[PDB]
Amino acid sequence: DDVKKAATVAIAAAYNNGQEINGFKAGETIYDIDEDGTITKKDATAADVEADDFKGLGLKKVVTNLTKTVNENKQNVDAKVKAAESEIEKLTTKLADTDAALADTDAALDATTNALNKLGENITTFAEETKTNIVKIDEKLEAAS
Amino acid sequence: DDVKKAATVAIAAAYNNGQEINGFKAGETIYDIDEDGTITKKDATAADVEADDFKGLGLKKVVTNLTKTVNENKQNVDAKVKAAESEIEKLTTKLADTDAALADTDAALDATTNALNKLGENITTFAEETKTNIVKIDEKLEAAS
Amino acid sequence: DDVKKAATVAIAAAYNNGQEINGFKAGETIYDIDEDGTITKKDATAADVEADDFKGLGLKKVVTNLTKTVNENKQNVDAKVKAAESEIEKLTTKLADTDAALADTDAALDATTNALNKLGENITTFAEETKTNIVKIDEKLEAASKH
Ligand SMILES: [Cl-]
């Protein structure tokens, strides 16, 4: 009967879909359904398993593992980014301390430059007044002879 | 008949696979198939739902949500990395401005050091010529008794 | 018979589940099962395909592609983070070189300030000893005048 065959194909088809969802291993019974509706009862070899889309894991196991990978990869990158941001924060505070110390260096350099200029002007005046006094003395001596 | 039984198992199995793909909720009819091929018509409890791999969501809904998570996690990290890189770009420009200001400080310090050395050489000569002149006058006075 | 119908529904249901796992395309036979258990043999249109959850790809193909996306996105971000960290490492070494050069500038500025102060102290003494000497000579001349 054609109803006997249809029930047989349906069992085999439901069985195979179940293995796609829940997986299979070497030795486990697998059914191959022909275009002619001919059902072949085989046993999954190491080849069938190794060269399967998910290597006999099944859709449920793969999706569960993928969910684990997605979350693990997010935790891992979130912590790498938090590390880099902390390094950036420490470089910012150090660069701010460097700029502050340079501003102090400039203020000290400017006070040193100004003191040098004042000393130079004070020496120039003193040298001019000394020259004038020595010249006056020489003239009093050059006259007294 | 064994064909009656086979059709019944096939319906129950196809129903069960459909729930794995499309999901189930508390109250919804669930079928438990025995190794003996005995089909039990139960009703999904809150336990069956809460302690299910995807909590009755089904493979389609989970994979759809996972695709949403993957893309959302990529947008989120891409923007955190773009933020960190902008902070790095601003630290680079500021450090380059700091090094430039320090190079100017060094040039100004070298000019101050050089002017200080020249001034020191200039007073040494003046001080030497003053000593010579005072000593000559002292001799002119010591002679004139 | 009710067993004839049950076998027919089961075939159609198993066929549909298979399409959800392995996918479909426009033209491919699709079965629509009624609540009444009435099976309708249709042909997937461009609408059925375009407005499907995974657009007829099937669960296997979507999960395989998603695995590719997850790994590609991890490789891509791992390299962007490795790039940023290398930039951070180079900024650290340059900032350390800047701080070292500033410490040298300060030491040189401190030596210049100290040499300026000593010079100012030496000129003051010389200037004081010169006034004393000119003043003594001026007195030796002023006395030698009052005769
Ligand atoms: Cl099925």
Helix (H) or strand (E) holding B23: none
Q: What is the CA radius of gyration of chain C?
A: 49
Q: From the CB of residue B132, how many other CB atoms can be counted at a distance below 10 Å?
A: 10
Interface residue of B1, B113, B119 to substitute, partner A, most A CBs within 10 Å: B119
Q: Which residues are paired to B43 by β-bridges?
A: B29
Contact list, A84 vs chain C (CB under 8 Å):
81, 84-85, 88
State the distance from the centre of ligand 1 to the C-alpha of A17, rounded, in angstroms: 5
Contact between B98 and A95 (Cβ < 8 Å): yes
What distance in Å separates the CA atoms of residue B21 and residue B34, rounded to the nearest whole number?
A: 21
Enumerate the residues of chain A whose CB falls inside 8 A of the CB of residue B53. 60, 64
| Pairs of CB atoms within 8 A across B/C | 115
The Cα–Cα gap between A110 and A102 comes to 12
Q: Give the Cβ contact number of residue B54 at 10 Å.
A: 17
Residue A62 and residue C70: Cα distance in Å, rounded?
Answer: 13
Task: Specify the residue for token string 């900032």.
Answer: C95
Q: Mind spelling out the 3-state secondary structure of B68-108?
A: HHHHHHHHHHHHHHHHHHHHHHHHHHHHHHHHHHHHHHHHH
d(CA A23, CA B53): 14
In which element (H, E) is residue A34 found?
none
Contact criterion met (CB below 8 Å) for C19 and C30: yes
CB atoms within 10 A of CB A142: 9
Q: Which SS3 state, helix, strand or coil, does residue C40 take?
A: strand
CA distance linking residue C11 with residue C31, whole number of Å: 10
Q: Residues followed by a break in chain B, C–N over 2.5 Å?
A: none
Convert chain C into a string of H (helix), E (strand) and C (coil): CHHHHHHHHHHHHHHHHHHHHHCCCCCCEEEEECCCCCEEEEECCHHHHHCCCCCCCCHHHHHHHHHHHHHHHHHHHHHHHHHHHHHHHHHHHHHHHHHHHHHHHHHHHHHHHHHHHHHHHHHHHHHHHHHHHHHHHHHHHHHHHCC
Tell me the C-alpha distance between A12 and C112, whole Å: 96
Amino acid at C109: L
> Are C6 and B11 an interchain contact pair (Cβ–Cβ within 8 Å)?
yes
The pair of structure tokens assigned to B12 is 């129950």
- Alpha-carbon gap, residue C75 to B77, rounded angstroms: 13
CA of B17 to the centre of ligand 1 (A): 5
| Residue written as token pair 């000393």 | A119
Gap between the Cα atoms of A18 and A12, Å rounded:
10
Given an 8 Å threshold on Cβ–Cβ distance, is C112 in contact with A112? yes
Q: In one letter, which amino acid is B105?
A: T
How, if at all, do strands A29-33 and C29-33 pair? Answer: unpaired
Phi, psi of C43 (to 5 degrees): -130, 125
Distance, CA of B103 to CA of B129 (rounded, Å): 40
The structure tokens listed for B61 are: 């809904």
Which residues on C lie below 8 Å from A91 (Cβ)?
88, 91-92, 95
Burial status of residue B129 (CB atoms within 10 A of its CB: 0-12, 13-18, 19 or more): middle
d(CA A102, CA C109): 12
Number of helices and strands in chain A (H, E)? 3, 2
Sign, CA dihedral B17-B22-B23-B24, equals negative
C13 phi and psi, to 5 degrees? -65, -45
**Both tokens of residue C109?**
């500025």
- Centre of ligand 1 to C-alpha A114, Å, is 94
How is residue C102 written in tokens? 């500033």
Residue A14, C-beta contacts closer than 8 angstroms, at least 6 positions apart: B9, B10, B13, B14, B17, C10, C13, C14, C17
* Helices B59-143/A59-143 angle, 10° precision: 10
Lookup: tokens for A6 = 């249809």
Residues of A in contact with C88 (CB under 8 A): 84, 87-88, 91
Q: Which of B18, B60, B70 sits opposite C70 (nearest CB)?
A: B70
Q: How many CA atoms lie within 13 A of B108 on its CB side?
A: 19
What's the gap in Å between A21 CA and the centre of ligand 1? 10
CB contact under 8 A, C1 and A6: no
Q: Using the structure block, give the residue that is written with the tokens 């501003």.
A: A103
| Cβ-based neighbour number of residue B66 at 10 Å | 18
Elucidation technique: X-ray
Report d(CA A67, CA A59) in Å as an integer: 12
Q: Alpha-carbon dihedral of residues C68, C74, C77, C78, nearest 10 degrees?
A: -130
Angle in degrees, CA C38, A16, B27, rounded to 5: 55
C-alpha–C-alpha distance, residues A114 and A120, integer Å: 10
SS3 A52: coil
Of C15, C66, C81, the CB nearest to A81: C81
How many residue pairs from chains A and B have C-beta atoms closer than 8 A?
113
C-alpha closest to that of A66 among B58, B14, B69, C18: B69
- What 8-state DSSP symbol labels residue C53? T
* Cα(A124)–Cα(A138) distance, integer angstroms: 21
The chains found to touch A (3+ Cβ pairs under 8 angstroms) are B, C
Q: Which of A70, C53, C50 is nearest to B58 (CA)?
A: C53
- DSSP secondary structure string for all residues of A94-135: HHHHHHHHHHHHHHHHHHHHHHHHHHHHHHHHHHHHHHHHHH
**Distances from the Cα of C121 to the Cαs of A118, A120, B130, C114, C126, in angstroms?**
14, 13, 18, 11, 9
Instruction: List the single residue in C101, C130, C144 with the smallest CB-CB distance to B130.
Output: C130
- How far CA C115 is from CA of A119, A137, C112, in Å, comes to 13, 34, 5
| A64, two tokens | 């569960």
> Which residues from C are below 8 Å from A115, CB to CB?
116, 120
Instruction: Tokens for A21, please give them.
Output: 């969802």
Nearest Cα to Cα of residue C42 among C56, C28, C30: C30
Chain A residues within an 8 Å CB radius of C124: none
| Own/partner long-range contacts of B82-88 (Cβ < 8 Å, ≥24 apart) | B84/A81, B84/A84, B84/A85, B84/A88, B84/C84, B85/C84, B85/C87, B87/A85, B87/A88, B87/A92, B88/A88, B88/C84, B88/C87, B88/C88, B88/C91
| Cross-strand partners of B29 | B43
Q: How far is CA C70 from the centre of its chain?
A: 19
Chain B residues touching C98 at Cβ < 8 A: 95, 98-99, 102
CA distance A87 to C90: 12
Dihedral sign of CA atoms A55, A59, A64, A68 in order: positive
Name which of B21, B89, B112, B132 to mutate to probe chain A: the one with the most chain A Cβ atoms within 10 A of its Cβ: B112
Chain C nearest CA to A40, separation (Å): 17
Could you give the 3-state DSSP secondary structure of residue A2? helix
Residue A143, classed as helix, strand or coil, is: helix
Would you list the domain boundaries of chain B?
A: 1-56, 58-145
Q: Is A41 exposed, middle or buried (0-12, 13-18, 19+ CB in 10 A)?
A: exposed
Q: How many CB atoms lie within 10 A of CB A2?
A: 9
Question: Which of C54, C73, C140 has the CB atom closest to B70's CB atom?
Answer: C73
